[model samples]
Target: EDKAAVERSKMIDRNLREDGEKAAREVKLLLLGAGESGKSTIVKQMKIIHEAGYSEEECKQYKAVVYSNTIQSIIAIIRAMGRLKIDFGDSARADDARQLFVLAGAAEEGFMTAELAGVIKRLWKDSGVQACFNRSREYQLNDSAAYYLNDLDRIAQPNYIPTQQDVLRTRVKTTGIVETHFTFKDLHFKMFDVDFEGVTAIIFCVALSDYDLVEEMNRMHESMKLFDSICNNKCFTDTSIILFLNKKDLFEEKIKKSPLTICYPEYAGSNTYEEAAAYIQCQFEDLNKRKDTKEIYTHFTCATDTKNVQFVFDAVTDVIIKNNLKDCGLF
Candidate 1:
C-alpha cells in the first residue's frame, strides 16, 4: 500500500511541475514609439479584442479626456488664427471666440459645461475655423480634432457615454510604464508600453502623417532616428522587431494636400496614397542598419480603426510567438 501511495504522489508532483512551467512561460511583448505614435491605442485595442472590453464604468473615465480634446483642439485653432494671419470669416463670431479665449486663460477645471460646448459648436461652424483646420498641419493639432468636433452633439450631452471607438481614438499621453496581460491559444502573454531585456518582440510605431510636420527636428526624422537607435541596440538584438507605420488614415488625407517632398525633398513619386505610403515604408525599412542580423516586419496601420489593428496584431502575434518558441527551443 505504501509503494502505491508513493507512486501516486510522484505522478502528482510531475503534473504540478508541468503546469507551473507553462504558467511561467509567458511571452513578453514591448510597444515602443515616439509621442502620439498610437502605442497606447494598440494597447487599448488589445483590451477590446482579448480582454473583457471596457465596462461602462471604464468608459466614463474617458469622458473627461474626450471633452478636453474637443475644447483644446478648437481653442488651439483659435489661437493659431493670429499666428497663421487668418481672420474669422464672420465678424459676429468674434464674441464667441473671445469667450473661448477667456475660458482658456482660466484654469481648466471641471468637466466641459453645456455652455462651453455651445461656444465650441459655433466656432467650429465658422468658415474661418474650417480654414484654420485646413492648415492644421502648419501647427500642432490633435488628429482627433475633427472626429470629436463633428460628433459634438452625441458626446457633449449630459447622458453621453463613450463608445468603443471613442475610447480607442482618445489620446492621452503615456507618461510611464503601462502593462497589459492577455492569453492567446492558452499561452499567457504580457505586454509593456516600455522595453527591457528578455523581451520576446518589439513593435515600434511611426506616425505616417508626421512626414509633413516638424517638431524639434522633422517629426518623421525623429521617428526614423529613434527607430535606428532601437534597431541597433544590442539589448534587443535577438528581439523580433515589427514596424507599425501608424495613422494611415491621416496620412492618406494629408498626402492629397501636402507633398511627400515636403519631408523628403529628393523624392520624385506621383502623389498617390499608395505610392506615398510605400515610399515612407521603404524609408523606415532602410533604417535597419543590422539588416544582416535582423529583419523588420512592416505594416500600414490605422490605430483608431479597431478592425485593422485587430487583423494586423493577430498576424504580428503569430509571427512573434513562432519566433519566441523557436528561440526557447520549444517548437
Candidate 2:
C-alpha cells in the first residue's frame, strides 16, 4: 500500500514522514538575515506552498495581504513620525532652539531624536547605535491611544492598549491574524506569514550585512538585540530557522567592482561568494554550538529557484514529521 511505502520511506530516511502521527507536529520556522538578502522572498515562497490549493487569482489576493500590511505599516510609521515631531516640538522649550535645530537636522538625515540617539550611543558605545536601533518601537495609528479611542468599536479589546510595548505586541498578534491562512492540497496546509512593523526588525536585517552605511547599519544591529531577546525568551524554543543564501547570481557582479574594500575592510579583496556562504554558515554553526537544549536546522536556499524551494520544503516537512509536530494540526 502507499501508506506502507510511506512508512518504509520514513524508516529508511532520516527526514521523511512515517505516518499520520508523525506528520501532525507543529513546524515553527523563523527567518533571519539582512535586508535584500531574500528573507522576505523565502517567506513569500513558503506562503505559496502553504496555500498551494489557491487558484492563481486567489493566490494573488492572498499575496496582496502581505503587501497591504507592509504599505499600512509604512504609512502608519510616517504618521507616527509626524506625531513624534509634534511631541518633540512640544517637549523642546524656546531656549532649546539650537538643540531643536540639531535634532531637526538629524531627523532630516533619517536619524532618531537626540534623547533616543544618546540612549543608543551609551548602550552600544562603538556599535551601540546599531544595537539600539534594532529595539526601537514603531509609531502607528492604532497604536496611538487617541486614534484607537476614536475608532473604539473597530478596535479589538486586546488591540486597544495605550503603551508602546502593548501596541508593538498587539501589532505582532494582528499580523499573525491577518496574514495567516489555510489552503488545501490532499490535506489542509496552514501558515502564519506575519510582518514586523518599525525599524527594530528592519535594523536587525541591515546589521546582518556589511553595508556602506556603517552608522545606520550599526544602529539597526543595536536595535536587533531586543529582537534577539524576544526570540530567545519567547520564540526560540518553538521556532525553526531557515537560512537562504540568495542573490548568488549577483555575487560576481558585486565582487567585480569590490564594495567589500570600503564596506568590510578586513575581507577586502578576498571575499568571494563561497567565502561569504561559509561565513554565514559559520555564524549559524556557532549559534547552534552554544545552544544545549533547543534544536535548530540550517539550509541554504535560493528563493528564485523553484526546485531549490521544493528541496527546502521537503527538508522542512521531514523535520516536522520526524519531530511529531503534526499532532498539533496545520493551524
Candidate 3:
C-alpha cells in the first residue's frame, strides 16, 4: 500500500548518501614560492573559482593600494636612477621632471593625496614620464610597474572596482607565508603558502628564462636552484611535483631582444623561440627526482592570465583528485 512512498524515501536516501560521500572528499594544497611570485594573486583566483567572487565594495578597497603601488614604483625607479645615475633626458622636459620630483616629495607625506594621482595621470603621457616608464627596468622597477601606470585613467576613478586583470597586475610584497582554505566541487583544500611545506603535490612556478633579476647572476640557474632544492627536499620525497615554466607571453616579447647566453654560457643552442623555450623546459624538468611514490607534471603558463592559470590548474585538479581518491581507497 505504501510502495510509492517507500520508493520516494529510497530515492531521497540515495541522494543524501551521495552528498555525504562528496562531503568526505578533502585535499590539502600548499602554495610555495618566492615572496613576489604571485602567490597571493593565486589565492584570489581560488576565491573567484570556488567562491562567488569579490564584491564591488571589496574590489574598491584596493584603490588606495593601487595608487600607492604606482607612486612607490615610480619613486623606486627615480631613486634607482639617482643611485645608478642613469639619466633618461636632458633639459628638454626639465619642468616636467621638476614637477615629477615635486610629486614624489608630496607623495612622501601621504601617497593617497590628490596631487600625486593628478600628476601620475596627467604627466604620464608627457615625454618625460614616458622616458622614466620605458626605462623602468634600467631603474630596477618590477615587471608590472609600467602596466599599472598605463592603466591610470580607470584605476584613478573614485568608484573604481578592480577587475581580475587589475588585481593580477597589482603588487603587494609579502615576507611571510600564510594559509587559506576553500571547498571545491567535492574537495576541501587547505592552501599553506610558499617557499616550502610537506604536501601531497607541489607546483613550481618559474617566471621565464629571460627575466634576470639584478640581484642574481643567471636567471634560469637561480630558478633551477630553487627547483632543485624543492625536488631534493627530504620531507617531500613521496610528493608529486608540477613544474610551471611560466610567462610564455613575456618570454616571446623579450627573448628576441634578450639573448639566453647572457646568463648561461652553456646555452649553445639557437636563440629562436622553440630552441630557447625547449632548453628552459629541459632545465626545469632535469631537477625532478622521480619514483613510484612520486611523479612530475609540467606546463608553460602565462601566470598573469586567469584563463591560462585556470586551465592549467584544472589539469592539476585531475592529478590531485586521482591521487587523493586513491589514497582514500575511493578511486
- Per-model C-alpha lDDT, please? 0.83, 0.37, 0.65
| Candidate 2 lDDT tens digits, 129-248 | 222222123222222222322333323223222332122212222222223333322223344333422101110122233322333344223324434453354434444433344444
Model 1 lDDT tens row, 197-262: 678889999999998898557999888999999988899888999999999999999999899998
Q: Which scores better on lDDT, 1 or 3?
A: 1
Please, what is the TM-score per model? 0.90, 0.44, 0.81
The top-ranked prediction according to TM-score is: 1
Candidate 3 accuracy as TM-score: 0.81
Residues 1-331 of candidate 3 have per-residue lDDT tens digits of 1433343233222244645544444465667655555567777777777786666777767666677677777666555655665554544444545676776665443244455566555655555456655555444566677778787766666666677677667776655667777776455677766744437677777777345444545556677788888877887775667777776877787677677776566899988778888888877777776644566788887777778877887877776655444332221
Sort by lDDT, best first. 1, 3, 2
Cα TM-score of candidate 1: 0.90
Error of 2 at 126 (Å): 41
Runs in model 3 lying further than 4 Å from the true structure: 1-22, 83-92, 107-118, 121-123, 126-139, 195-198, 291-294, 328-331
